Design a protein around this ligand. Structure first.
Ligand SMILES: Nc1nc2c(ncn2[C@@H]2O[C@H](COP(=O)(O)OP(=O)(O)NP(=O)(O)O)[C@@H](O)[C@H]2O)c(=O)[nH]1
Ligand SMILES: [Mg+2]
Lengths: 205, 994, 11, 123
């Protein structure tokens, strides 16, 4: 039971960072532009069983667009992403939506305004109304602070499964298991790690 | 093996193409990733379009045919006009022919909707190039073939839908103004025949798939077609009755009727008024009889999420709110229309109970529109009394924590509803309060929601009624707290009690003994260990103080001293259990009160008493830490010092100009402390390396420096005596921070220094020209070298740098005149460097500095520095501005780029540049800069965009310079240029549009 | 009004 | 969830990092509650940590007595220690872990409980 999810939006809006956070828990601070598309399987554990998303993380920059709307064929759900600190990324949301629903005429779509962690927000909440007539679900999100970072997949899971009461549940925790020829090896890696400062030491956690 | 199709010298192996395509779509892992890079490279082949006719006819994979049409699409939209003519007619009949063949095979027409729609969009791209000047019979032949087959007729509706979108909905960004208008007029000139086909299909039935596709196209027509097509036919009757009954057409029909409610209609014809009432009455009738009655529980329906119920209820809310916001007056006077009006609003009431944030905001905007109207419009509110009564309950029960934007919208409507009937509002709130007491609705969330609602309507009731209401609410809330047992319950009720009282300052101001009891209870709460209680007591304390500060500074009747003195006397006992940041809020609150005292000697005395504890800890540490500076190694001392400074920041934040006496008490020793801390940071980086800047020890030390800079910034930004700032503060400050910044390694420089200097230049820059020069010398070159190697490193230094240059360019431009010519050249390089940033903060300032710099140079008149500036940097600024305008990577700054470019071109066509922009030999003598500007621009654009014709470049520049006194038209011409550079063969006459 | 104070303090 | 047969000895909020030695870079693995779970029918104590919202496991390993908690250069509220068998993402892998807390107090309390659990696990 796996579903194809296309992720579209202007370059730099955080699509790749948002997926990475869900894949590994990491926050990628660097902007390495996606070239064409990257496919990533993403599994969530629900009270209705596991649900698998084949996330097609497409490229936002035009010079790296690749197959463009070719990536959308047979998509079963989608996330349109923009940057609340960049008005132009919201101005382009109708363009991405147009290209998307011309190929996928009847799929659940989430509209995401990313980077709400930044104080100087440029796209005010009362200005975000495009989702209304297009029946898209909207969420303020931040891949940096994890604000609502689970909501887009929770909503899509409920739509794709047909159960408004579907919930994320805890994966079962197996008991964990219990060499001198690798002592000097682990001591080398550990000494480099102690002298590499942990990132974001000013955060609350 | 997979990379064979990239070889075009051979024949294309179609079967090998589908293998790469299938491995991409249905594959996974490394093989899918490899096929992906192959397909991208195949599609990006500039000769891939040649092999599109083979793929499209002999391939059996629809994804491959789809990819082929994408290759065609890129060819049609970018290089169509470069092709030999026979290729263009050869692409056209190929696409027209395939679409006909796909429509005739019912199996393909049923199974390959994606490929057919992709073919239709590709056809529309051809129409945008060829129609109607090279295809005047398209619309007639389309109407002809429609009656032949239902399948091709349905597909014709898809083609017309896409055509209407490309011409009217998405043309603004994608084609020139002339090209857009040409197509709009062409569609407008032949719509009569198009609407005739559309109306016939709608009225004759009977294929759902054909009817829906026709309604889908009608939705697009309503964006632009004249209203006569809607009101002078029978189409409103069909939409509001026939097509609302069947669920297949109901969704699209409801969207059409929403758009009909936005048609530009005449407001004085009574027949159009009746037609507007009539389709609303039919639509509401069909919903009541075919979907659900007005009493239905829409909240439960939406939560069940069956089929398309959520989309329908969303669309119904949009239809109702849209129509009623424009036309509800048509229903308010006729007695026969009263039930229709109230049933419409009763549906909206039911929609407003749905648990869906974004839907609630949509209905809340309409309620705001309504109750605002009932508040001002005569004789209106009595109509909606039962609607408004239910609304009060809906809003009270969905009150959110004060998105704060949603709370402010809820508060605004509830305030209106309280004005419209004060008595009903109080009754609902007390009733809900009783349901909290009897336990039937008791909940942590429910008691907070009610308190927020009760708090939101403050200032709308009369003071007498508010007095009795507040007392009643506090009474019930008090009894609710005593009834509960356990900490957690008693903590939640106690906070809500404190929230409500903080929301009613008018009540507090008139009942001192009550106000004092509240404050003393808050003080008592500052010793409670329970989580959140202390934050609640501090937040409420300063909130009450902001609104009631005058009652803390006067000597109240029955009292021997102003209550401010009583707070100060016991401040150590009160805050002894508080976290440092909670202590700073407390001190800031006291600073608010003290500033109300306008007797200078009394204010300074209160300020001295308030700062007694931090001043004594300060005097001690300055004594001990100076003999000898080893105590600053202790992280405990570093933390204590930061807290003392932060306390000064908190008090200075609320007292501003009044803080000056306290600043003078610590100023010299603080700057001395700044130097001592700076030495240890430097010593630490020398002894341990750059990694030392990440250590807690050094981060603690830099915290002291940053808080000192923030304190000085905070005062200077609010100071009223600038003479004291210039002659007492500025000189020791610069000596403390400038050299230390310049001579530290980059990783140890505090960006806060740049920020602090920005404030200094902003307030008193005009009074310290030698100081501004000193700031530039110490921070300009060394900070520029930190930020001119990439757009990534040192982000804060980057933003503050350009904020600092901007204010220097505004307030002390003389400082740049003194720069050595090599340094002024770096200044120009830095400005253009800011152009190329995608970072909005840097980009906006870079363009603003450029604009302000040009103005500064212009004000100098005909003077050797002004002329040398134009000789050296005019064409640098013109060409660098053109680069970011045209590179598709700085679209966020288009408006500022255009303004700067327009100013640059206007200087030449106003003859404001006295010197020659050219060399004496490069161009004949007596040539105007205007003639030379056109040459330089023509040659620049010819080399930057070699695919343009010389005629295009000449027409664009002729229009651009001609329009340099009209920003809106100037920008339109730039947008037309940005479209034409994306293709070959742009019409040069397009630039005559204005 | 004055009857609230005792209960307010006793929270 | 396969946690009912265990007992909660210690529970603290924390952020967990894995060290990418090939990139000279720390990378977050998850933020949420870190728990010390004492199995009732083996008396062994393990680290079990789940991410908030998604509840996905980002740390699952026994508090081995071999492991040693060491400070990080840029933090007074974190510990770095090598792990040789963590099964959070499947097959037992080895990591150099870093875990950060809200305060120096919770970091010192963690190290206390971490060592008490080390003593329980060598009996
Ligand atoms: N502050 C903040 N920055 C974020 C957030 N999400 C992403 N970013 C930053 O935004 C930048 C762009 O990241 P990326 O995910 O590559 O964007 P993208 O949309 O995938 N780019 P492209 O479309 O070109 O592939 C990165 O530097 C990343 O750190 C967020 O929630 N907050
Ligand atoms: Mg990316």
């Amino acid at each position: 039971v796996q579903f194809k999810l296309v992720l579209v939006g202007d370059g730099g809006t955080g699509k790749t960072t948002f997926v990475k956070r869900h894949l590994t828990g990491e926050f990628e601070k660097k902007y390495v532009a996606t070239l064409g598309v990257e496919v990533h399987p993403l599994v969530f554990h629900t009270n209705r069983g596991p649900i698998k998303f084949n996330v097609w993380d497409t490229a936002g920059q035009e010079k790296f667009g690749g197959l463009r709307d070719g990536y959308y064929i047979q998509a079963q759900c989608a996330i349109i992403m923009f940057d609340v600190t960049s008005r132009v990324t919201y101005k382009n949301v109708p363009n991405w939506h147009r290209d998307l629903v011309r190929v996928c005429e009847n799929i659940p779509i989430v509209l995401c305004g990313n980077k709400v962690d930044i104080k100087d927000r440029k796209v005010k909440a009362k200005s975000i109304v495009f989702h209304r007539k297009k029946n898209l679900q909207y969420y303020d999100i931040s891949a940096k602070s994890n604000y609502n970072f689970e909501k887009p997949f929770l909503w899509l899971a409920r739509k794709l499964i047909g159960d408004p009461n579907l919930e994320f549940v805890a994966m079962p925790a197996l008991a964990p298991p219990e060499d001198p020829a690798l002592a000097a090896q682990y001591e080398h890696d550990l000494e480099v790690a102690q002298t590499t400062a942990l990132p974001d030491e000013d955060d609350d956690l | 093996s997979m990379e064979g199709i990239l070889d075009f010298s051979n024949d294309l192996d179609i079967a090998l193409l589908d293998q790469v395509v299938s491995t991409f779509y249905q594959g996974s892992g490394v093989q899918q990733k490899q096929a992906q890079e192959i397909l991208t490279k195949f599609q990006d082949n500039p000769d891939a379009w040649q092999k599109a006719d083979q793929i499209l006819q002999f391939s059996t994979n629809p994804q491959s045919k789809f990819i082929a049409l994408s290759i065609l699409d890129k060819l049609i939209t970018r290089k169509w006009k470069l092709l030999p003519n026979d290729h263009r007619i050869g692409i056209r009949n190929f696409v027209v022919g395939m679409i006909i063949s796909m429509c005739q095979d019912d199996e393909v027409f049923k199974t390959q909707k994606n490929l057919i729609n992709k073919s239709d969009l590709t056809l529309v791209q051809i129409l945008k190039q060829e129609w109607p000047q090279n295809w005047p019979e398209f619309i007639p032949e389309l109407i002809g073939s429609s009656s032949s087959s239902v399948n091709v007729c349905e597909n014709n509706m898809i083609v017309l839908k896409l055509l209407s979108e490309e011409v009217f909905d998405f043309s603004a960004e994608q084609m020139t103004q002339a090209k857009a208008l040409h197509l709009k007029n062409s569609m407008s000139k032949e719509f009569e025949q198009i609407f005739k086909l559309c109306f016939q299909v709608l009225e004759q039935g009977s294929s759902s798939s054909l009817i829906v596709a026709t309604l889908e196209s009608l939705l697009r027509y309503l964006h632009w077609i004249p209203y006569r097509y809607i009101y002078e036919t029978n189409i409103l009757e069909l939409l509001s009755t026939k097509f609302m009954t069947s669920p297949d057409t109901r969704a699209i029909t409801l969207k059409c009727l929403t758009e009909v409610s936005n048609l530009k209609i005449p407001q004085d014809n009574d027949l159009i008024k009746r037609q507007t009432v009539l389709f609303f009455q039919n639509t509401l009738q069909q919903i009541a009889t075919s979907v659900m009655p007005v009493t239905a529980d829409l909240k439960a329906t939406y939560a069940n999420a069956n089929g398309n119920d959520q989309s329908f209820l969303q669309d119904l809310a949009m239809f109702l709110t849209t129509y009623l916001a424009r036309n509800r007056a048509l229903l308010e006077s006729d007695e026969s229309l009263r039930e229709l009006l109230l049933n419409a609003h009763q549906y909206l009431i039911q929609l407003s109970k749905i648990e869906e944030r974004e839907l609630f905001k949509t209905t809340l905007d309409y309620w705001h529109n309504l109750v605002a109207d009932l508040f001002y419009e005569p004789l209106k509110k009595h109509i909606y009394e039962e609607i408004c009564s239910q609304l009060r309950l809906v809003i009270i029960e969905n009150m959110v924590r004060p998105t704060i934007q949603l709370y402010k919208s809820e508060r605004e409507v509830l305030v209106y509803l309280t004005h419209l009937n004060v008595i009903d509002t109080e009754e609902i709130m007390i009733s809900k309060l009783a349901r909290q007491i009897d336990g039937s609705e008791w909940s942590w969330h429910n008691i907070n929601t009610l308190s927020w609602a009760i708090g939101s309507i403050s200032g709308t009731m009369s003071e007498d009624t508010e007095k009795r209401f507040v007392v009643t609410v506090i009474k019930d809330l008090l009894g609710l707290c005593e009834q509960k047992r356990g900490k957690d319950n008693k903590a939640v009720v106690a906070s809500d009690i404190m929230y409500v009282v903080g929301q009613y300052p008018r009540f507090l101001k008139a009942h001192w003994n009550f106000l004092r009891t509240v404050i003393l209870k808050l003080f008592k709460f500052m010793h409670e260990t329970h989580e959140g209680v202390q934050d609640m007591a501090c937040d409420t304390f300063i909130k009450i103080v902001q609104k009631c500060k005058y009652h803390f500074v006067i000597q109240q009747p029955r009292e021997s001293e102003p209550f401010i003195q009583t707070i100060i006397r016991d401040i150590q006992k009160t805050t002894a259990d508080l976290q440092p940041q909670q202590v700073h809020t407390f001190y800031k609150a006291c600073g608010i009160i003290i500033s109300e005292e306008r007797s200078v000697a009394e204010r300074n005395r209160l300020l001295s008493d308030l700062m007694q504890l931090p001043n004594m800890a300060w005097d001690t540490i300055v004594e001990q830490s100076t003999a000898n500076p080893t105590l600053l190694l202790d992280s405990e001392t570093v933390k204590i010092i930061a807290n003392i400074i932060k306390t000064n920041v908190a008090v200075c934040t609320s007292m501003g100009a009044d803080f000056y006496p306290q600043l003078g008490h610590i100023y010299y020793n603080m700057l001395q402390l700044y130097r001592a801390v700076s030495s240890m940071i430097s010593a630490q980086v020398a002894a341990e390396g750059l990694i030392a800047t990440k250590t807690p020890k050094v981060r603690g030390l830099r915290t002291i420096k940053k808080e000192i800079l923030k304190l000085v910034e905070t005062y200077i930004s609010k100071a009223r005596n600038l003479d004291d700032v210039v002659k007492v503060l500025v000189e020791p400050l610069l000596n403390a921070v400038l050299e230390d910044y310049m001579n530290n390694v980059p990783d140890a420089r505090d960006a806060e220094v740049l920020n602090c200097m920005t404030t200094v230049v902003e307030k008193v820059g005009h009074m310290i020209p030698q100081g501004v020069i000193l700031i530039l010398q110490s921070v300009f070159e060394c900070t520029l070298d930190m930020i001119n190697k990439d757009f990534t490193e040192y982000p804060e230094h980057r933003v503050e740098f350009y904020k600092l240059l901007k204010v220097i360019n505004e307030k002390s431009f003389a400082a740049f005149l003194e720069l050595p010519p090599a340094a002024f050249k770096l200044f120009v390089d830095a400005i253009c460097w800011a152009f190329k940033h995608n970072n909005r903060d840097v980009e906006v300032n870079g363009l603003q500095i450029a604009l302000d710099l040009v103005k500064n140079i212009e004000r100098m008149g005909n003077v050797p520095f002004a002329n040398e500036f134009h000789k050296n940097y005019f064409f640098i600024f013109v060409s660098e501005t053109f680069f970011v305008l045209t590179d598709s990577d700085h679209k966020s700054g288009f408006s500022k780029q255009a303004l700067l470019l327009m100013k640059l071109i206007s200087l030449v066509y106003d003859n404001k540049i006295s010197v020659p922009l050219y060399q004496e030999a490069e161009v004949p003598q007596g040539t105007s800069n205007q003639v030379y500007l056109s040459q330089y621009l023509a040659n620049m654009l010819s080399n930057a965009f070699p695919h343009l014709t010389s005629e295009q470049i000449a027409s664009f520049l002729s229009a651009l310079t001609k329009q340099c006194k009209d920003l809106v038209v100037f920008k339109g011409t730039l947008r037309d240029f940005l479209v034409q550079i994306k293709e070959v063969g742009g019409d040069p006459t397009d630039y005559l549009f204005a | 009004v004055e009857a609230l104070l005792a209960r307010l303090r006793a929270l | 969830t396969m946690e009912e047969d265990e007992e909660v000895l210690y529970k603290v909020r924390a952020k967990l990092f894995r060290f990418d030695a090939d990139a000279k870079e720390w990378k977050e693995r998850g933020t949420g509650d870190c728990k010390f779970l004492k199995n009732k029918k083996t008396n062994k104590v393990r680290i079990l940590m789940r991410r908030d919202k998604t509840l996905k496991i980002c740390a699952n390993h026994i508090i081995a007595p071999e492991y040693t908690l060491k400070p990080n250069v840029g933090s007074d509220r974190s510990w770095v220690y090598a792990c040789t068998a963590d099964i959070a993402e499947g097959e037992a892998e080895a990591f150099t872990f870093a875990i950060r807390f809200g305060s120096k107090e919770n970091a010192d309390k963690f190290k206390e409980e971490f060592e008490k659990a080390q003593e329980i696990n060598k009996k």
